[PDB]
């Protein structure tokens, strides 16, 4: 059930609305006002799959259900769930099980998240690879439980490491040779349907299965304009 709606912090505001289907969509002037300020400082800001709202803050971790509307003080009623050392991650995202991946210091650790302040998350942590990390680009899941991710300027997908033996990037298979470096952004719905920015267009369409897959000469145009100011940009 329910295809999630695409949300933005644009400007310090925080807004949501169905994502836009053509170019002559404005988007924002018809977006829903989510948040009235305050959003421009997070350094993540992320939505679990169970629909919980998550955000990095001055290098600590809030969570709660998302605010449905702008006077909704999000922060006032979050739950913190970490003190400290939050700011130290380059990544901080979910598997479509629940699962938090987090890569600090070119490693990358798995577990489930954090449910109070004093969880040592880092600590309990399984750490299932121990290099290399630190060099994507983008790296994010599909709602299948492939791992997806940008390293120079190519694009890769495989099954995520099972342990920190498992030599990811060489059994990856690569649906990209160029042009992945130049997005801002670049995620899936909760449908598989890959989004792109890339020079303050937005583009959607079914993602590369090979390497010689032109995404950008097939893609859908649904956005011309504004698209590379927005802070934070997902589903
Ligand atoms: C980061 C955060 O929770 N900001 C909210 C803001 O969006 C909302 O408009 C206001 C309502 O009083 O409270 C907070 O400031
Ligand atoms: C990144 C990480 O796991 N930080 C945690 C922090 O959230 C928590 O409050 C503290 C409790 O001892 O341990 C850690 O440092
Ligand atoms: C990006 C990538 O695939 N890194 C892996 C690393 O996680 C793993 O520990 C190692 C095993 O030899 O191989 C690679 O370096
Ligand atoms: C961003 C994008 O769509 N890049 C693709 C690239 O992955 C592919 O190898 C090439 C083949 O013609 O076309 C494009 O450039
Ligand atoms: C961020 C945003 O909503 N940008 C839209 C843009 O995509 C669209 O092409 C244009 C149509 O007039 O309006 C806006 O600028």
Same mark, same amino acid.
């Given at each position: 059930?329910?295809?999630?709606?695409?949300?933005?912090?644009?400007?310090?505001?925080?807004?949501?609305?169905?994502?836009? @289907?053509?170019?002559?969509?404005?988007?924002?002037?018809?977006?829903?006002?989510?948040?009235?300020?305050?959003?421009?400082?997070?350094?993540?800001?992320?939505?679990?799959?169970?629909?919980?709202?998550?955000?990095?803050?001055?290098?600590?971790?809030?969570?709660?259900?998302?605010?449905?509307?702008?006077?909704?003080?999000?922060?006032?009623?979050?739950?913190?769930?970490?003190?400290?050392?939050?700011?130290?991650?380059?990544?901080?995202?979910?598997?479509?099980?629940?699962?938090?991946?987090?890569?600090?210091?070119?490693?990358?650790?798995?577990?489930?998240?954090?449910?109070?302040?004093?969880?040592?998350?880092?600590?309990?942590?399984?750490?299932?690879?121990?290099?290399?990390?630190?060099?994507?680009?983008?790296?994010?899941?599909?709602?299948?439980?492939?791992?997806?991710?940008?390293?120079? @300027?190519?694009?890769?997908?495989?099954?995520?490491?099972?342990?920190?033996?498992?030599?990811?990037?060489?059994?990856?298979?690569?649906?990209?040779?160029?042009?992945?470096?130049?997005?801002?952004?670049?995620?899936?719905?909760?449908?598989?349907?890959?989004?792109?920015?890339?020079?303050?267009?937005?583009?959607?369409?079914?993602?590369?299965?090979?390497?010689?897959?032109?995404?950008?000469?097939?893609?859908?145009?649904?956005?011309?304009?504004?698209?590379?100011?927005?802070?934070?940009?997902?589903?």
């Amino acid at each position: 059930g329910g295809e999630s709606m695409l949300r933005g912090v644009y400007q310090d505001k925080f807004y949501q609305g169905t994502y836009p @289907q053509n170019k002559n969509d404005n988007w924002l002037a018809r977006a829903t006002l989510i948040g009235k300020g305050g959003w421009s400082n997070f350094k993540f800001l992320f939505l679990s799959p169970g629909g919980e709202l998550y955000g990095v803050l001055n290098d600590k971790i809030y969570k709660g259900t998302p605010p449905t509307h702008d006077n909704d003080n999000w922060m006032g009623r979050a739950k913190k769930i970490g003190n400290g050392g939050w700011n130290q991650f380059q990544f901080l995202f979910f598997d479509p099980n629940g699962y938090l991946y987090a890569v600090s210091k070119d490693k990358l650790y798995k577990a489930s998240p954090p449910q109070s302040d004093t969880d040592n998350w880092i600590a309990r942590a399984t750490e299932v690879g121990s290099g290399g990390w630190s060099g994507f680009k983008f790296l994010f899941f599909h709602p299948n439980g492939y791992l997806y991710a940008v390293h120079g @300027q190519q694009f890769y997908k495989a099954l995520p490491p099972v342990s920190n033996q498992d030599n990811w990037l060489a059994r990856a298979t690569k649906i990209g040779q160029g042009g992945w470096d130049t997005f801002k952004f670049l995620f899936f719905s909760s449908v598989g349907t890959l989004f792109g920015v890339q020079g303050g267009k937005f583009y959607e369409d079914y993602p590369p299965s090979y390497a010689y897959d032109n995404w950008l000469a097939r893609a859908k145009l649904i956005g011309n304009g504004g698209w590379d100011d927005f802070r934070f940009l997902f589903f």
